[PDB]
């Protein structure tokens, strides 16, 4: 189906102690493939997926220089933003940046994005047309006016609509055995009696890729929400994901409840029932 | 690959 490449950048100021901590990661869909950590000893962009190992040394030289240039800009932004909000020099603050591109099932351009956050709140973001900006407050309006006069949206649009889509297609081809292979969830249910009249039914979904999935509980066919607990999708650690949904049902009425699992790797939706 | 060096805020 659809696909996406995304890059994440985080810079945390450590005033008085040195340069900001800088961490950068790259994702194709739900798979990380590159990383950089300013506290690592290599001081280089590093691979994190097997299909990116096919890139020559000039790839890693280019990505290392560009990723360090990102950290230099964030280093100055932390100082600039500190002055925009009249903050003190002794406090720690965080800059976050995310951008990338989505493609459809035909691998043609679908949308691009470029977003920026200060201290975990929206600061400025590129709009859908990739030609204008959304400023979240007065301090960001100064950035918006600066970035509009410099026409930096033209440069980003050329990357998001061109370079970004071209390399996403290349990665999907070089990693077709992993990025294009779907992993259906392996499901099972557990039963635990919390008393002599109620029981907990937990519907499990393990070892699936990609991470998108929906678990819904139904009683006699109608949806259920009360006494239903749903946990966030979590990484298993091997490239696949896990998720479970639980419900507290009366004893002797377990056969009235059904768990419905929907995932790309499933030809038809799964239906789970305890007896 | 990622984008080139960004403009400062």
């Amino acid at each position: 189906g659809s696909h996406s490449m995304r890059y994440f950048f985080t810079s945390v100021s450590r005033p008085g102690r040195g340069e900001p901590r800088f961490i950068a990661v790259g994702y194709v869909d739900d798979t990380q493939f590159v990383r950089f950590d300013s506290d690592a000893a290599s001081q280089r962009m590093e691979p994190r997926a097997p299909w990116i190992e096919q890139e020559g040394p000039e790839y890693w030289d280019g990505e290392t220089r560009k990723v360090k240039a990102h950290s230099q800009t964030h280093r100055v932004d932390l100082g600039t933003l500190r002055g925009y909000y009249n903050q003190s020099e002794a406090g720690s603050h965080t800059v976050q940046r995310m951008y990338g591109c989505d493609v459809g099932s035909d691998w043609r351009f679908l949308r691009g994005y470029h977003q920026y956050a200060y201290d975990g709140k929206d600061y400025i973001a590129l709009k859908e047309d990739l030609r204008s900006w959304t400023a979240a407050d007065m301090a960001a309006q100064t950035t918006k006016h600066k970035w509009e006069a410099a026409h930096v949206a033209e440069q980003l649009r050329a990357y998001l609509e061109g370079t970004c889509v071209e390399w996403l297609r290349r990665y999907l081809e070089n990693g077709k055995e992993t990025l294009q292979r779907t992993d259906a969830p392996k499901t099972h249910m557990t039963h635990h009696a919390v008393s002599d009249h109620e029981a907990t039914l937990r519907c499990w979904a393990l070892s699936f890729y990609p991470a998108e999935i929906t678990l819904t509980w139904q009683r006699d066919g109608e949806d259920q929400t009360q006494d239903t607990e749903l946990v966030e999708t979590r990484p298993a650690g091997d490239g696949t994901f896990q998720k479970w949904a639980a419900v507290v049902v009366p004893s002797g009425q377990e056969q009235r409840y059904t768990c419905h699992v929907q995932h790309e790797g499933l030809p038809k939706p799964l239906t789970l029932r305890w007896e | 690959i990622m984008d080139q060096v960004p403009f400062s805020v």
Partner: T-cell receptor
Amino acid sequence: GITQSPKYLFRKEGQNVTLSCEQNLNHDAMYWYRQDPGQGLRLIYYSQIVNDFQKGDIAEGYSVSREKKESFPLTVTSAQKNPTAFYLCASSITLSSYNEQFFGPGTRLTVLE
Amino acid sequence: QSVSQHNHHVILSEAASLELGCNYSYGGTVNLFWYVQYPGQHLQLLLKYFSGDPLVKGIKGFEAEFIKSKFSFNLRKPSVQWSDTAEYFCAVNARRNTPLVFGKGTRLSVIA
């Protein structure tokens, strides 16, 4: 736009001279070039952003600083033994390939004894 | 990285065709520029390849052709003028956080 030291200037032996270069274009990147007759433009120093500068191909004998965003002063020390040279300052929005460089008028520096 | 302008000095009569070669040694994607330095004036951008059409129109009837396979960005003008007498610089940027690289330049003399 970009302004730099007067179109002409001279120095004496054993003396250091600082060439100023300023821009109100809100540009992050600034550059210093030396234009030699048969060699074209030769990069001395470039500054990707404030507080950051890197050596060019002929950085020997020169020093720079970037304590402010607007200014990129080039200092020609006495170790630089060229009797005459033409220095160009430039700036761009960023170091990105999409941003062209705007150039100052230039400066002729002569050794006058 | 280097940029090669093969003609060091070109002397042309008026209304003749101009063809200034430019080649670069970098092997990835690039952006390309042509600068002109008229006598007594500073360097100013003549044209640039941003994206899209490899045939790039410029000011004063100039046109350049970006050929990815030949790593060339030759500058052309069908009918030169006397006012075209200047120095012409080719410039290429390699998109890896490295500064723009200029060629050695080509001096154009247009016989009045």
